[model samples]
Target: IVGGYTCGANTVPYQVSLNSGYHFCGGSLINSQWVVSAAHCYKSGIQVRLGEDNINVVEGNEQFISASKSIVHPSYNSNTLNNDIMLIKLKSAASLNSRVASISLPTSCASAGTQCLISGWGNTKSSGTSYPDVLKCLKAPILSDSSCKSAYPGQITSNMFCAGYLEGGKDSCQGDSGGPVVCSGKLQGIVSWGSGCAQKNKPGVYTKVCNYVSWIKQTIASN
Candidate 1:
């Protein structure tokens, strides 16, 4: 939640925390039994926490569910950070309510110029080592494919997309990985990787969800 403002309680019902014994990444609940997150977030001892706005203190609506299984995209590459998407199967289904819910998957890719919302417990300041207890949120505009390439040079790929400020003031820093990038009330991307937080011209690099929608659907159906 670094570099962003504190989110109101229950404001992001679909938000979920991927705890590898710590809040290491953010996620979005796609359903009662499944969570969508970054594939790079994979680690042992992973658990899913829902209906929680604060990471330190548990609210009444919070549910701690053990992860029974983790399904990482088969083509995911650790070195290149390609296809960095993952799905978690909860041991028990989450209870949906005012403070807990699932988000919709995008039917299509986010258009260039669309405004998106990203929230997490990641560091606010790029260089700060501390993180927020409460979830922080900020606006990140989705950039055109060409523009994103211009910023990242040899890094930006079709499977990845861009969202954040080029000026470098606001972005998801360390600990914000695996979070959702919601645009038009749809899950468009997953926080996969970044270069030193909100650095100039280095907007957050996310795994494009639209490219993996078919995979998500098939996996959820068969699993």
Candidate 2:
């Protein structure tokens, strides 16, 4: 995503940093106590910020929530990037004001070819630089299973979903991992990987939210 001076542009809506101050991509809140994001986001730590228009921490408008614990899908594998989803349990529930509202997780994911929105403050171009002080967001349609399978013939898996501009110019780049791909107020996926950021012949891959529903509920209960 790219940040500039438009409705969706110039706003880094879905990214967060760790308590140790390491930054990672993440999504919006699911409830005061839960945040839907990616498993990889946990590697850095558990301090999360959401709904801020600016990407820079110096901006002073962001809301920071300390997480009591982070739960990644047990089947997740950093190497394969499979089952790459997680939830951050906030130390305390967040306040439900305009700047700190939670987004809903999908009870059922979208079918192939459904349109959705993906947002971030990640690198604009593949292997390029990241935005300095703003958030960015964009909309893209989900790919049909056969189309996505053919596009990422090697890496595509049942646990993943694909979205992006096939012709190019629009995509999820570095620092975008763990963000949400929302459709109809439901979170269908979590940004996971792509062949290369913004590379042609490759759509951004995301963790399939529907596939892990049982795990998500069980984990939340156990934790």
Candidate 3:
């Protein structure tokens, strides 16, 4: 995460790393066996690592579980990057503890100007391979829908929202996709896309989690 600080060990319990020996994307544990991430991050043999702070080291509290099933939103469109949310069912249920737990999905939308916390192990630069080992977090405020549309005309849809500083220097970057964007302790957004890492007037776009609560509940219930 650009312009963010390292997160304390296991402080963000719902945070997870999409890894296959190396961190690739970030995700949130919504339940003991279910994870929420971006559709674009899906691939075969996905490994979900929970209770992770430092990606390069073997933190004793970590739990590595393979994805048993993955369900990408039905309307997901890669061309426009809409409906980018995905649900991943773990092969085994994760054990709940102080270092590992699930986060509740948001029932209501976060309003503009609401301060949110975004955490991930994405690139620390706008351009380059500077992925951090430790999870990084930053506080970014939700931007109005109009502001988001103005920033990316014809690209911002109802299923997506933008957050960050219009002046730049802070954002979720490459490898951060699928990470949680928490507002008031609820999982309100999923790291999806952005114009650049941390460019001015180009805030980070996220999958609006509030719009998918029903879908999540239905899918989890049926599965």
Candidate 4:
């Protein structure tokens, strides 16, 4: 039931499916050998696309990157969504063609009020249904940790980042989870959860990429 969107110039991005044949959200190709996505997106029979738009576009050319392995941080708790992050290793390295490229992870994420871009095929409005094919994106300001804490009250953690309007209306909704939250053209966070899409004082919560550097490096290195 969780979902959201993804943003990047790569015509062909990555995607994951769940128990049903439903493809939930989009992910970015962080490296030829690895993909960055949300942990909750991990499900059986998941598939990845490398160089095409929409599932039917270039049907034969869509490289089915198998989820040879899925590693969700051991500390991830669904209720709190702590450490709600994961990395997917392709069975083999994908070819870095024009449509396939990796996104750079930020060494540091900006504080609240910084502008960032969130892209995906998620719902356009709160409580709306997901888009069928086309991708959509929006710009949102990062919310300060203190502000987020006051708003969510004990729900925001160091491992999570917050962004969106305090007054509400605009956010990543169902099918948007497990996608990227980019700032300054760098991957800064992964969409995790929020209070029913875009609600007052409930901007989206994300897995802070800055906090997972060591884990990401180690995982990428070990694979």
By lDDT, the best candidate is 3
lDDT of 3 by residue, 1-223 (tens): 8999988889899999998768889999999999999999988889999999888988699999999999999999999889999999999999999999999998789999999999999999987779788889999999999999999999998999999989988999999999999999999999999998899999999999999999999999999
Best by TM-score: 3
Model 3 alpha-carbon drift over 4 Å, by segment: none
Reference-based TM-score, model 2 = 0.87
TM per candidate comes to 0.97, 0.87, 0.98, 0.87
Is candidate 3 or 4 superior in TM-score?
Answer: 3
* Residue-level lDDT tens digits of model 4 in 1-223: 2233443344434332221254576677788888888887777666676664454344443566677887888888878888888888878888876566788888876788888777665666666564645555678889888888887898888889888888877787777777777788788888788889778878888889888888899888987
lDDT of each: 0.88, 0.71, 0.93, 0.72
**By TM-score: ranked, best first:** 3, 1, 2, 4
Q: Worst 10-residue stretch by lDDT in candidate 4?
A: 11-20
Candidate 1, which segments miss by more than 4 Å at Cα? none
Worst-scoring 10-residue span by lDDT in model 3: 126-135
Cα lDDT for residue 140, candidate 3 = 93
- RMSD of each candidate? 1.0, 2.7, 0.8, 3.2
Q: Write the per-residue lDDT of candidate 1 for residues 1-223, one digit (tens) a residue.
A: 4467888989999999988667888899999999999888898788899988778886678999999999999999999999999999999999999899999998989888899999988877777687888888998889888878898899977899988888988888777889889999999989888788888988889899999999999999999
**How does residue 198 of candidate 2 score in lDDT?**
69
Could you give candidate 2's per-residue lDDT for residues 52-124 as a string of tens digits?
6654555544667788887777778989898888887888776666555666667777886688878766777
After best superposition, candidate 3 residue 207: deviation in angstroms? 0.5
